Amino acid sequence: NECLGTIGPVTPLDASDFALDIRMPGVTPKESDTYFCMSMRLPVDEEAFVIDFKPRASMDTVHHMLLFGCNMPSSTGSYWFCDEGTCTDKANILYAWARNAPPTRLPKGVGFRVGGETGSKYFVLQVHYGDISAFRDNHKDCSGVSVHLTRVPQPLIAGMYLMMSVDTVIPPGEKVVNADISCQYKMYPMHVFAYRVHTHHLGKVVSGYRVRNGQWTLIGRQNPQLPQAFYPVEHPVDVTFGDILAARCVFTGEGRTEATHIGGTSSDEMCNLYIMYYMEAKYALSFMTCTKNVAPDMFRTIPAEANIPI
Ligand SMILES: [Cu+2]
Ligand SMILES: [Cu+2]
Ligand code: NA
Ligand code: NI
Numbered sequence: 418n419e420c421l422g423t424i425g426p427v428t429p430l431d432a433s434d435f436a437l438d439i440r441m442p443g444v445t446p447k448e449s450d451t452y453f454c455m456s457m458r459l460p461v462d463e464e465a466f467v468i469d470f471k472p473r474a475s476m477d478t479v480h481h482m483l484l485f486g487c488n489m490p491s492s493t494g495s496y497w498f499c500d501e502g503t504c505t506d507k508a509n510i511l512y513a514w515a516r517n518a519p520p521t522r523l524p525k526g527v528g529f530r531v532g533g534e535t536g537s538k539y540f541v542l543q544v545h546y547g548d549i550s551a552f553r554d555n556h557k558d559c560s561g562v563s564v565h566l567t568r569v570p571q572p573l574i575a576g577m578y579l580m581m582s583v584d585t586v587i588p589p590g591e592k593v594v595n596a597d598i599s600c601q602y603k604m605y606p607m608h609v610f611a612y613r614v615h616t617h618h619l620g621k622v623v624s625g626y627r628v629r630n631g632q633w634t635l636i637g638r639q640n641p642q643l644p645q646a647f648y649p650v651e652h653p654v655d656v657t658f659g660d661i662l663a664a665r666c667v668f669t670g671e672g673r674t675e676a677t678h679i680g681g682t683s684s685d686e687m688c689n690l691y692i693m694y695y696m697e698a699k700y701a702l703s704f705m706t707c708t709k710n711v712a713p714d715m716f717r718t719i720p721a722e723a724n725i726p727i
Contacts, residue, residue, distance in 0.1 A: 434566065
């Protein structure tokens, strides 16, 4: 999509709403699978709500797009290679765009709280470019996301419950290495309405469940090699004080000469389930994390679908 120029990135939509265009500053790559990142400081310092997203991606070149909220983007630069990292602090993912999988809208009345004393101060946009053949004419690129914000407080607040492995070790050649993650949920009810899975090249399947009175309700189950959008939850899932959240990524060691651990680089691995929820405004918190596996013996009664690939 076109570069803005003289009109700037902020469009007022009315007295209390405005659209913010986060775009690449006319960038040109040189190699394939290049990863680019930029930051936008929120224009308002007071609290606001991300109520909508609109992708502005040149359909030829872009593989996927990710947008985060954080307070300390990795580079105080115009743009940068995301191998240097996205944020110094916790990067809160808000929006994922996939080529072969068109995203879903936020439910009306649900919004991410940003800015203010506690909300994110910056957005970080990440654009993964696939094929770089589109630069034979040599145009610059301004692909990115147009985000809808409002000062109007939303009755429901969007949030992110991130489940992720930290201690996994994938022995070389090994056929099946499971990565389990489990936490007991101790907040006010949330309603999970979407999930995204993340793995590197060795993941076979990733699936998260709710365990309430020792019974596994499925949140999401996905092949991590399939374009990593936020897919919507079939039937929306409440999670309540007492419930336990459980995720397993399934990995293979085949075609690897040396053991693989959890890490940044592509020759490393990751086991991330991004459970995306909403809560009642007055009870909501914006981000939760599980990096533990507190109920490991519980994983014996896991459904057998979680072990076969989709
Ligand atoms: Cu991609
Ligand atoms: Cu990764
Ligand atoms: Na990264
Ligand atoms: Ni409910």
